[PDB]
Motif scaffolding. Structure first.
Motif, PDB file in Angstrom:
ATOM      1  N   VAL B  41     -21.372 -17.696  30.171  1.00 41.40           N
ATOM      2  CA  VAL B  41     -22.691 -17.166  30.628  1.00 41.40           C
ATOM      3  C   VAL B  41     -23.646 -18.288  30.788  1.00 41.40           C
ATOM      4  CG1 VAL B  41     -24.374 -15.546  30.202  1.00 41.40           C
ATOM      5  CG2 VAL B  41     -22.001 -15.119  29.541  1.00 41.40           C
ATOM      6  N   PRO B  42     -23.910 -18.420  32.289  1.00 38.20           N
ATOM      7  CA  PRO B  42     -24.932 -19.587  32.683  1.00 38.20           C
ATOM      8  C   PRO B  42     -26.189 -19.108  32.387  1.00 38.20           C
ATOM      9  CG  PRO B  42     -24.527 -17.886  34.408  1.00 38.20           C
ATOM     10  CD  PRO B  42     -23.655 -17.657  33.313  1.00 38.20           C
ATOM     11  N   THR B  43     -26.774 -18.177  32.108  1.00 39.73           N
ATOM     12  CA  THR B  43     -28.208 -18.143  31.962  1.00 39.73           C
ATOM     13  C   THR B  43     -28.384 -16.639  30.882  1.00 39.73           C
ATOM     14  OG1 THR B  43     -28.686 -18.730  33.945  1.00 39.73           O
ATOM     15  CG2 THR B  43     -30.630 -17.810  32.301  1.00 39.73           C
ATOM     16  N   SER B  44     -29.130 -16.639  29.954  1.00 40.83           N
ATOM     17  CA  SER B  44     -29.670 -15.300  29.100  1.00 40.83           C
ATOM     18  C   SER B  44     -30.088 -14.469  30.191  1.00 40.83           C
ATOM     19  CB  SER B  44     -30.404 -15.574  27.910  1.00 40.83           C
ATOM     20  OG  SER B  44     -31.377 -16.602  28.345  1.00 40.83           O
ATOM     21  N   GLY B  45     -29.379 -13.223  30.464  1.00 39.79           N
ATOM     22  CA  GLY B  45     -29.840 -12.035  31.285  1.00 39.79           C
ATOM     23  C   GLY B  45     -29.070 -10.895  31.120  1.00 39.79           C
ATOM     24  N   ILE B  46     -29.023  -9.980  31.956  1.00 33.58           N
ATOM     25  CA  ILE B  46     -28.128  -8.599  32.157  1.00 33.58           C
ATOM     26  C   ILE B  46     -26.995  -8.900  33.224  1.00 33.58           C
ATOM     27  CG2 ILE B  46     -28.081  -6.328  32.855  1.00 33.58           C
ATOM     28  CD1 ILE B  46     -30.623  -5.622  31.515  1.00 33.58           C
ATOM     29  N   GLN B 106     -27.395 -17.301  26.725  1.00 25.84           N
ATOM     30  CA  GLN B 106     -26.988 -18.519  27.664  1.00 25.84           C
ATOM     31  C   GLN B 106     -25.603 -19.233  26.902  1.00 25.84           C
ATOM     32  OE1 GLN B 106     -29.120 -22.241  28.085  1.00 25.84           O
ATOM     33  NE2 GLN B 106     -28.802 -21.846  30.299  1.00 25.84           N
ATOM     34  N   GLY B 107     -24.583 -19.489  27.412  1.00 26.77           N
ATOM     35  CA  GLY B 107     -23.639 -20.117  26.846  1.00 26.77           C
ATOM     36  C   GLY B 107     -22.692 -18.999  25.926  1.00 26.77           C
ATOM     37  N   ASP B 108     -22.859 -18.000  26.389  1.00 26.59           N
ATOM     38  CA  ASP B 108     -22.330 -16.878  25.845  1.00 26.59           C
ATOM     39  C   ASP B 108     -20.790 -16.849  26.236  1.00 26.59           C
ATOM     40  OD1 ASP B 108     -23.565 -15.423  23.702  1.00 26.59           O
ATOM     41  OD2 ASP B 108     -24.399 -13.885  25.283  1.00 26.59           O
ATOM     42  N   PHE B 128      -7.731  -9.324  37.794  1.00 23.36           N
ATOM     43  CA  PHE B 128      -8.877 -10.425  37.900  1.00 23.36           C
ATOM     44  C   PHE B 128     -10.064  -9.967  36.794  1.00 23.36           C
ATOM     45  CE2 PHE B 128      -9.013  -6.494  40.713  1.00 23.36           C
ATOM     46  CZ  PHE B 128     -10.081  -5.821  40.113  1.00 23.36           C
ATOM     47  N   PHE B 129     -10.709 -10.535  36.843  1.00 24.74           N
ATOM     48  CA  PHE B 129     -11.967 -10.492  35.608  1.00 24.74           C
ATOM     49  C   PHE B 129     -13.409 -11.445  36.148  1.00 24.74           C
ATOM     50  CE2 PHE B 129     -13.101 -13.450  32.070  1.00 24.74           C
ATOM     51  CZ  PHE B 129     -14.008 -12.607  31.526  1.00 24.74           C
ATOM     52  N   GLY B 130     -14.277 -10.778  36.212  1.00 19.25           N
ATOM     53  CA  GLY B 130     -15.575 -11.390  36.749  1.00 19.25           C
ATOM     54  C   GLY B 130     -16.779 -10.704  36.576  1.00 19.25           C
ATOM     55  N   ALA B 131     -17.848 -11.520  36.752  1.00 16.91           N
ATOM     56  CA  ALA B 131     -19.290 -10.812  36.280  1.00 16.91           C
ATOM     57  C   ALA B 131     -20.239 -11.362  37.255  1.00 16.91           C
ATOM     58  CB  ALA B 131     -19.718 -11.146  34.798  1.00 16.91           C
ATOM     59  N   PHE B 132     -21.319 -10.442  37.382  1.00 18.60           N
ATOM     60  CA  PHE B 132     -22.560 -10.955  38.159  1.00 18.60           C
ATOM     61  C   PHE B 132     -23.844 -10.687  37.496  1.00 18.60           C
ATOM     62  CE2 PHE B 132     -23.539  -6.811  39.941  1.00 18.60           C
ATOM     63  CZ  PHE B 132     -22.291  -6.049  39.972  1.00 18.60           C
ATOM     64  N   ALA B 133     -24.874 -11.625  37.644  1.00 17.43           N
ATOM     65  CA  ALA B 133     -26.067 -11.262  37.117  1.00 17.43           C
ATOM     66  C   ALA B 133     -26.849 -10.047  38.015  1.00 17.43           C
ATOM     67  CB  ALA B 133     -27.040 -12.399  37.082  1.00 17.43           C
ATOM     68  N   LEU B 134     -27.769  -9.564  37.323  1.00 19.33           N
ATOM     69  CA  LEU B 134     -28.565  -8.522  38.109  1.00 19.33           C
ATOM     70  C   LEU B 134     -29.977  -9.070  37.950  1.00 19.33           C
ATOM     71  CD1 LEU B 134     -27.001  -5.557  36.291  1.00 19.33           C
ATOM     72  CD2 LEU B 134     -26.948  -5.805  38.945  1.00 19.33           C
TER      73      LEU B 134
END
Lengths: 212, 134, 211, 131, 79, 134
Positions: B41-46, B106-108, B128-134
């Protein structure tokens, strides 16, 4: 504004242990991870690992897994790298850096030097290099280990100064000189004092240089 | 700048679910990173994090989990199961999909652990497996 | 565990030139690549992330490109403060390896060494060993030749010299050459001279004192 | 922020509705049943598709589902059931980097048995990134 | 609000105004000089109550799981 | 960024509630919830809603298992999203999920309706529902 400051590098004997501290300031410390990156004298960059000061969720470069341990103390905006059973390979500059997104090392510290050798510390001697546009200096001789700090008039005389890369004398001690060119006219007006600082020996002098 | 990662499985390995982000339709954007088959996880967030597996007494399962220091270590976020029982006369098929929105530091480290690997239909369409910031 | 490979170990270029460095990934890496400029002793600096986006405060003259396996860093109008070692780095997956790096030496209008010589300090004499330093201030190119004469006896095995880095404002090297001997040997002779040969000078210069 | 949500509709004696109940198209996003759904901006979109079914065979249904675009397969889900009444629903979502003017459509294998009771069959898109 | 089921609350002004009648969707909201403007739904579009909805539902056919009708006012009265 | 993720929780003996703080559940800036009311969001906008429920389908049949998120002439609920899986078999497990873009208005409340809370799996990331602004 953002400020990272390493500290605690110095002399360690092989198989020994040492811990480095990285002080943070100018960003809410607990919502950003601290990296540790190192570089063997005049070589590439190597990522050691990182620590999230909020949840301690450390992630290591396996090269140092179970031999290095990164901790942090959010009560003191500080990150820690402790390194056990140090060696030759491990002698280096050790940087702490906090990013933007995780893999973008954005802000760096100044770095700190761990020298891994068997030999003992030693403080340096400071001798003036008096002038004969004139050029004068400071001979900092017979010290161990790296590094030494030279600055002139407490960071004022910054221009024209050349503080040389130190030399490894056959004696096993380091030596360097710090020369600066000034107006030959005003060797009577201006005072020229060189600030030497060699932390591993807690030596710290101001040497005033002037003609005979 | 908003991060998003989309990982597909490597079909060469068939007997293990290895995540890759090299293809034209699989990628890392704006800060996402990989680390031993985990997504960092690149940045702390949702983030909205999703994943799907497809399958072709047998037990099938697939969970997207978040790695933690404290108590349970491997904390699942999205899990789903499916029993298939002997009496198999047809080319049976099955698709467990699931996504959701989570609070991440971050870094999760997001990773997925699945039961019934050798049945996986490895493809950019299916597993597949992915995620996106909101 | 990906490796990186930077194309030129080093490179010489002149102010304003177009400098281009390549870095090859051992596998495809989407476009997750960074570029850092370092300098001497000081910490690295972030120039480029995600292969092509410049970072905050990075001069426009810096530009990043590259697709999947091969990447490139280009500078349009090479300044002198544009001097360091430039590392590429896969930001794709841990442990986020760096290429070897690329060192840049800026070309300039050949300069002459402003030579100086220094009599050993009396304080240093007190302690039993004496060093005489010679300085070669602000010259180009680094290539130079210093020789010590003690009553025109060529010295060897007792000379120790070190050069600085390319200065970040005028791209000149500076050299020191410390000559160390015991106090006995020092007072046993009289004429001490440092002999410098470089293009910047018409003929090899010499500097000296005696006492 | 370009977006689309379309609902399943029975036509002939399968199509997609764009205005009733929940369906909608935003700023200039396009659609036409024989063509697909076009988006007004280059970017990363999250596509999704869910289809509800009504299995009532008097077997082994090869019920599948997919959104595409020589067409390009993007996302695909499936359920075969052999097994009166047999309702099941199949769904998927995923990030695709779509370009302006490109069209994404849905392809279903078994329109003979697709449930149409409201939020049972629908597909849609939202931009998330790129700029 | 006031009495219900013929009126609803629009928060863009602090006065509650008229609902729309069955068979219509809102084509414009309350001003403080205007009342809710409606408009009749399309072929296969239907609604079933006074509604602050800005779009009509969809008339479906009867799914072989049929006595009529459909229209803008009430629905597939299937049974 | 208004958002919600709620986890399933077991109530009385045969029912169902939704958790808002434990494990992964969370509500952001002033988003509201109460079991008997639903989930309300603090901003007018386009949201992605989602809902997934895990079941333990172990018969003593013909289970008519369904899934629904609805919102609230005021006391006339509006169905938004719905998924269903009817399954006839000691044995089985199944999971049912859906998500979709709904244009929600400030103060509107959304809830989930499950057909068979007698047999809903509660083992972590198996049952949850949530919302995020886009």
């Amino acid at each position: 504004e953002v400020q990272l400051v390493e500290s605690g590098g110095g002399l360690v004997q092989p198989g020994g242990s040492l811990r480095l501290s990285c002080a943070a300031s100018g960003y809410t410390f607990t919502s950003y991870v601290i990296h540790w990156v190192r570089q063997a004298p005049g070589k590439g960059l190597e990522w050691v690992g990182y620590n999230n000061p909020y949840n301690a969720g450390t992630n290591y470069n396996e090269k140092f897994k179970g031999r290095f341990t990164i901790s942090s103390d959010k009560s003191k905006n500080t990150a820690y790298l402790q390194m056990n059973s140090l060696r030759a390979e491990d002698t280096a500059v050790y940087y702490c850096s906090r990013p933007t997104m995780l893999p973008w090392f954005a802000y760096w510290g100044q770095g700190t030097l761990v020298t891994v050798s068997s030999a003992s510390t030693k403080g340096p001697s400071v001798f003036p290099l008096a002038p004969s546009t004139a050029a004068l200096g400071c001979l900092v001789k017979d010290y161990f280990p790296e590094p030494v700090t030279v600055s002139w008039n407490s960071g004022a005389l910054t221009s024209g100064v050349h503080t040389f890369p130190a030399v490894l004398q056959s004696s096993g001690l380091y030596s360097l000189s710090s020369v600066v060119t000034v107006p030959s006219s005003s060797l009577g007006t201006q005072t020229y004092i060189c600030n030497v600082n060699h932390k591993p020996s807690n030596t710290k002098v101001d040497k005033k240089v002037e003609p005979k | 700048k908003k991060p998003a990662a989309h990982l597909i499985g490597d079909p060469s390995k068939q007997n293990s679910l290895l995540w890759r982000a090299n293809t034209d339709r699989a990628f890392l954007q704006d800060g996402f990173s990989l680390s031993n088959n985990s997504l960092l996880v690149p940045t702390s967030g949702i983030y909205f994090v999703y994943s799907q597996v497809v399958f072709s007494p047998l037990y099938l399962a697939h969970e997207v989990q978040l790695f933690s220091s404290q108590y349970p270590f491997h904390v699942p976020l999205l899990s789903s199961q499916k029993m298939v029982y002997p009496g198999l006369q047809e080319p049976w098929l099955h698709s467990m999909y699931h996504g959701a929105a989570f609070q991440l530091t971050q870094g999760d480290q997001l990773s997925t652990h699945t039961d019934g690997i050798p049945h996986l239909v490895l493809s950019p369409s299916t597993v597949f497996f992915g995620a996106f910031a909101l | 565990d990906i490796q990186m490979t930077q194309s030129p170990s080093s490179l010489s270029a002149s102010v304003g030139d177009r400098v281009t460095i390549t870095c090859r990934a051992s596998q495809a890496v989407s476009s997750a690549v960074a570029w850092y400029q370092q300098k001497p002793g000081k910490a690295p600096k972030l120039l480029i992330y995600s292969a092509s986006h410049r970072y905050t405060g990075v001069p426009s003259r810096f530009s990043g490109s590259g697709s999947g396996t091969d990447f490139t860093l280009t500078i349009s109008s090479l300044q002198p403060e544009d001097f360091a070692t430039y590392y590429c780095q896969e930001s794709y997956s841990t442990p986020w390896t760096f290429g070897q790096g690329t060192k840049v030496e800026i070309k300039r209008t050949v300069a002459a060494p402003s030579v100086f010589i220094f009599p050993p300090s009396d304080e240093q004499l007190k302690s039993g060993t004496a060093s005489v330093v010679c300085l070669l201030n602000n010259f180009y190119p680094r290539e130079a030749k210093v020789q010590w004469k003690v009553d025109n006896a060529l010295q060897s095995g007792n000379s120790q010299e070190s050069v600085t880095e390319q200065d970040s404002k005028d791209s000149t090297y500076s050299l020191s050459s410390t000559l160390t001997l015991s106090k006995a040997d020092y007072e046993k002779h009289k004429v001490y001279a440092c002999e410098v040969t470089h293009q910047g000078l018409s003929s090899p210069v010499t500097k000296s004192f005696n006492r | 922020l370009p977006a689309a949500h379309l609902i399943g509709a029975p036509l002939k004696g399968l199509g997609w509705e764009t205005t009733k109940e929940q369906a909608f198209l935003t700023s200039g996003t396009q659609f036409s049943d024989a063509e697909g759904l076009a988006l007004p901006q280059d970017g990363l979109y999250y596509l999704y598709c869910l289809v509800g079914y009504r299995g009532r065979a008097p077997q082994g249904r090869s019920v599948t589902l997919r959104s595409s675009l020589t067409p390009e397969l993007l996302l695909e889900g499936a359920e075969t059931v052999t097994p009166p009444l047999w309702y099941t629903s199949v769904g998927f979502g995923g990030l695709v980097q779509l370009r302006r003017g490109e069209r994404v459509y849905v392809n279903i294998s078994h329109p003979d048995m697709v449930d149409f009771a409201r939020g049972k069959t629908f597909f849609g898109a939202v931009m998330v990134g790129h700029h | 609000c006031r009495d219900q089921e013929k009126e609803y609350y629009e928060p863009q002004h602090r006065i509650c105004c008229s609902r729309c009648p069955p068979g219509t969707y809102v084509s414009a909201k309350c001003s403080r000089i205007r009342d809710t403007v409606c408009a009749t739904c399309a072929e296969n579009s239907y609604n079933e109550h006074w509604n602050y909805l800005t779009i009509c539902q969809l008339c479906r056919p009867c799914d072989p799981v049929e006595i009529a009708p459909c229209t803008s006012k009430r629905k597939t009265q299937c049974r």
